[PDB]
Amino acid sequence: KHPIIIGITGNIGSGKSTVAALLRSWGYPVLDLDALAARARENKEEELKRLFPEAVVGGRLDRRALARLVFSDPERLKALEAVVHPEVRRLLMEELSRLEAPLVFLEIPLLFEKGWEGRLHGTLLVAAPLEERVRRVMARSGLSREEVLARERAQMPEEEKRKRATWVLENTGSLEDLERALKAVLAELTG
To answer: Residue 13 annotated as binding?
Structure first.
């Protein structure tokens, strides 16, 4: 039958990574759109190598340049997303094509900001205090914190994501966490 597709999202340092690992550990398919975005980029490389010559160094599309370029003027960013998002979904359905579970999860960072809401059957928002999130990230790149605070402001604020998500998961001790995802997952009878 048709599996209910749920989008899992959260902000910088929310730990949604942990949430998905837990759903995989509990045996649910959890596709990573980030990885697809990548494979897609590699797939439609030629198309991109022509849309952004400035990023092609020695026959190779430099992922660095591409992003410094793409994120320099909106027009371009929008032109790149016009090739990747279609391919991203072509592959997302390929993947779904090999599944038979009645419930699938999708790690879509930038879920709301990039208009995925209307593409899912529901959205699981993983939230946490900003302070705990910032610290949690500083333990990854230890990037000034102040730098982080500026990346955090790069996405749709959490309060806003919170106002429009179907379910919301907080954060403290893995035990409570293990419970909440257990409660949300229950509203969708799947085991």
So the answer is: yes
Q: Is 15 annotated as a binding residue?
A: yes
Instruction: Assign residue 150 the CATH number of its domain.
Output: 3.40.50.300
- What resolution in angstrom units was achieved for this structure? 2.8
| Residue 174 marked as a ligand binder | no
17 annotated as belonging to a binding site for a ligand: yes
Residue 16 annotated in ligand binding: yes
Instruction: Name the one residue in this structure whose structure tokens are 């990885």.
Output: 35
Report helix, strand or coil for 105: strand
C-alpha separations of 80 from 71, 136, 147 in Å: 10, 31, 26
Give the number of domains in the chain: 1
Technique of determination = X-ray
Say whether 99 sits in a helix, a strand or coil: coil
Q: What is the 3-state secondary structure (H, E, C) of 27-55?
A: CCCEEEHHHHHHHHHHHCHHHHHHHCHHH
| Cα–Cα distance measured from residue 37 to residue 171, given in angstroms and rounded to the nearest whole number | 28
User: Do 168 and 123 meet the contact criterion of CB atoms below 8 Å apart?
Assistant: no
Structural domain including 19 reads 1-191
User: Residue 14, annotated ligand binder?
Assistant: yes
